[PDB]
Design a protein around this motif. Structure first.
Motif, mmCIF file in Angstrom:
data_model
loop_
_atom_site.group_PDB
_atom_site.id
_atom_site.type_symbol
_atom_site.label_atom_id
_atom_site.label_comp_id
_atom_site.label_asym_id
_atom_site.label_seq_id
_atom_site.Cartn_x
_atom_site.Cartn_y
_atom_site.Cartn_z
ATOM 1 N N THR A 180 -3.481 4.446 0.071
ATOM 2 C CA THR A 180 -4.024 4.069 -1.225
ATOM 3 C C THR A 180 -3.648 2.631 -1.560
ATOM 4 N N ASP A 181 -4.236 2.132 -2.647
ATOM 5 C CA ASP A 181 -3.946 0.787 -3.126
ATOM 6 C C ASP A 181 -2.682 0.791 -3.974
ATOM 7 N N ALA A 182 -2.664 -0.016 -5.037
ATOM 8 C CA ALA A 182 -1.511 -0.025 -5.932
ATOM 9 C C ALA A 182 -1.386 1.296 -6.679
ATOM 10 N N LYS A 192 -7.763 4.174 -0.328
ATOM 11 C CA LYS A 192 -8.294 3.148 0.560
ATOM 12 C C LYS A 192 -8.924 3.771 1.801
ATOM 13 N N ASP A 200 0.831 -1.192 0.000
ATOM 14 C CA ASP A 200 0.000 0.000 0.000
ATOM 15 C C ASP A 200 0.871 1.250 0.000
ATOM 16 N N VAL A 215 -5.860 4.666 -5.879
ATOM 17 C CA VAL A 215 -7.108 4.150 -5.334
ATOM 18 C C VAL A 215 -7.137 4.415 -3.836
#
Ligand SMILES: *C(=O)[C@@H](NC(=O)Cc1ccccc1)[C@@H]1N[C@@H](C(=O)O)C(C)(C)S1
Length: 640
Positions: A284-286, A291, A124, A289
């Protein structure tokens, strides 16, 4: 339990290494990279923390509620709550989980990305977006701007449109003649180490009107801090400077792009003026995004500060000093509203906060008169002005009879032959001197005698009723006024000197305006206030109303009587009570003496204004009384 205690020390020493900013020493406490042990190597953990915690300006990591149990043969699970400080405030009530490993006597940490933030699961990422806060304004008692973030005009040059070669030095000299700038600096700014051919190199900020621009001259509209009165309130207001990387390490709530107060009120109220930085911190994600959001709040602009200052009074009080060393304090003595706090000589705060050259800043500190000094906050010997306090004390304890006439012959006097060659000196040779006469001619021998007669015990008893040693509730850094160095003069000579405002006395002009406020409130000391809304604090029964109604009419004669030491103020034709002073200091820089001229003055009819002016290291036949005509006219007209 013999090893569980050692595990609770590993978690404690690991958080300490993170909190101390040394991310490497923290990584050296993690296990080897594996699936059951640490999730990353030691060098990868270093870059993980340094990149993330450094991006949010994380400082001050503190933990609580540690609980270290067991899980397997060599695995001990650990947990704690944490709080830390970031660029967007405090992050509280964080829940951290993990596991430890004691493969031998040593216990390491099975590191995991959830130890950077509670819910960071694996690869993350963290993002931070911030909206910069607008700095609040400083305003006078009538809403006039003293320190604001205004729209300025900046004169810069681009070396590509200046000219080929000969036409370039001609345009550099044509731009230097249409803006009052050193022509050698026009070529020194375009030849700095950071200049490129098509770059905009700023020169100086244009004050107001924009003259004709020669070959290769342009103006860029830039926004920044602006001080309308400039030098007049430079010591009071102050200036703001660019925030440095070392500043953020101390207080991360600052905006790395914003400005920070460096001196004066801009620094004293830096918190209330800079506001609070707004933005959002999120995991965030990858990709981007989003989170889970950790911290987020809207930006808050800075609160404005309203002062008791009158801009018109501040400007007149400063201009009356003509650039000489001195200061002026004007108050409404019944409430303490500091109408003006001027200091001279001064520096330009706009040229200081927008763009000062490496040489002009050297001139301000190499200047012997020290323009950076807030002289209204510097202790001085109050001079012969202090006789008012000595007399008012001598009237309360009955030592001084207003009609008793001391017989003084000559200009020098000493108590005993035990004083050696020292003698109290007066300027006027008046044979018969009572209280009214001594305040008119400013007689030191009279004051010295009545102080020695009063005795040190009865003298300090009246002095302690004032503000000697107290710290005023003002946002101005100052030392408290002192009577002497120690709690006793232990010298008949020093006791006499303290009677007429010399000796070891140290009172700054603001504290003087506080102590002298008793003569406008019937012996009640009114504490000065600079913030407009602060409630008026006072101190009842400092001197008896008997002494006030005795000295205040005498202080009128200091102006009205033809031999009064302030008779030059009779030309005003306004009701005035005044008392001048000229103290002498022992300068070590030169054997010739340095003397300061003082002046106290207020309206004895309505008590609407009080004034204290001084001239440090005065020139010959210069005085504070000479320059007060203008400020007194304004204060008498606008503050009844
Ligand atoms: C107080 O300042 C008084 N005089 C002295 O302390 C001695 C002195 C020092 C320097 C120059 C002259 C005399 C009296 N107060 C001042 C004043 O009111 O300005 C006088 C010069 C009138 S003497």
């Amino acid at each position: 339990t013999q090893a569980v205690e050692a595990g609770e020390k590993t978690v404690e020493q690991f958080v300490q290494a993170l909190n101390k900013g040394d991310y490497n020493k923290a990584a050296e406490m993690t296990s080897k990279k594996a699936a059951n042990k640490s999730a990353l190597s030691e060098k990868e953990i270093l870059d993980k923390y340094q990149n993330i915690y450094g991006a949010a300006d994380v400082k001050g990591l503190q933990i609580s509620n540690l609980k270290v149990d067991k899980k397997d043969d060599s695995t001990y699970s650990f947990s704690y709550k944490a709080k830390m400080n970031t660029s967007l405030g405090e992050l509280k009530d964080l829940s951290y989980k993990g596991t430890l490993d004691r493969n031998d006597g040593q216990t390491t940490i099975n590191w995991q990305p959830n130890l950077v933030f509670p819910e960071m699961e694996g690869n993350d990422k963290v993002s931070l977006t911030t909206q910069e806060a607008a700095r609040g304004n400083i305003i006078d008692r009538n809403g006039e701007p003293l320190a604001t973030t205004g729209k300025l005009k900046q004169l810069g040059v681009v070396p590509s449109k200046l000219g080929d070669g000969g036409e370039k030095t001609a345009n550099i000299k044509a731009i230097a003649s249409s803006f009052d700038l050193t022509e050698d600096a026009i070529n020194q700014a375009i030849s700095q180490s950071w200049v490129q051919p098509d770059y905009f190199v700023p020169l100086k900020i244009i004050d107001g009107a924009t003259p004709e621009l020669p070959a290769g001259a342009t103006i860029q509209e830039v926004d920044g801090r602006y001080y309308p009165l400039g030098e007049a309130a430079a010591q009071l207001i102050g200036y703001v400077g660019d925030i440095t990387a070392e500043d953020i390490d101390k207080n991360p709530e600052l905006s790395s792009n914003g400005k920070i107060g460096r001196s004066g009120l801009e620094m004293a109220f830096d918190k209330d003026l800079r506001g609070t930085t707004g933005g959002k911190l999120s995991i965030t994600d990858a990709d981007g995004v989003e989170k889970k959001v950790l911290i987020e709040h809207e930006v808050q602009n800075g609160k404005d500060i309203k002062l008791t200052i009158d801009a018109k009074a501040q400007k007149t009080a400063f201009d009356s000093l003509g650039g000489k060393a001195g200061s002026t304090v004007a108050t409404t003595p019944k409430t303490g509203d500091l109408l003006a706090l001027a200091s001279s000589p001064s520096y330009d705060p706009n040229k200081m906060t927008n763009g000062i050259s490496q040489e002009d800043y050297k001139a301000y500190e190499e200047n012997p008169e020290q323009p950076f000094i807030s002289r209204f906050a510097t202790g001085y010997a109050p001079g012969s002005t202090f006789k008012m306090i000595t007399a008012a004390i001598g009237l309360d304890n009955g030592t001084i009879d207003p009609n008793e006439v001391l017989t003084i012959n000559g200009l020098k006097w000493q108590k005993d032959s035990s004083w050696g060659s020292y003698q109290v000196t007066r300027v006027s040779d008046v044979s018969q001197v009572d209280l009214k006469t001594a305040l008119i001619y400013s007689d030191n021998i009279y004051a010295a005698q009545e102080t020695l007669k009063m005795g040190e015990k009865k003298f300090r008893t009246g002095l302690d009723k004032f503000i000697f040693g107290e710290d005023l509730d003002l946002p101005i850094s100052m030392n408290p006024a002192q009577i002497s160095n120690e709690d006793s003069f232990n010298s008949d000579i020093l006791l006499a000197d303290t009677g007429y405002g010399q000796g070891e006395l140290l009172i700054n002009p603001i504290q003087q305006a506080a102590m002298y406020s008793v003569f406008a409130n019937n012996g009640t000391l009114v504490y000065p206030k600079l913030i407009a809304d602060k409630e008026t604090k006072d101190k009842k029964n400092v001197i008896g109303e008997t002494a006030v109604q005795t000295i205040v009419p005498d202080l009128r004669e200091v102006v009205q009587d033809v031999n009064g030491t302030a008779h030059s103020l009779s030309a005003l034709g306004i009701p005035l009570a005044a008392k001048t002073g000229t103290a002498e200091i022992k300068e070590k820089q030169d054997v010739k003496g340095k003397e300061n001229s003082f002046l106290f003055a207020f309206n004895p009819d309505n008590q609407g204004y009080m004034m204290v002016s001084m001239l440090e290291n005065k020139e010959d036949d210069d005085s504070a009384t000479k320059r007060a005509s203008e400020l007194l006219q304004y204060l008498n007209q606008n503050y009844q």
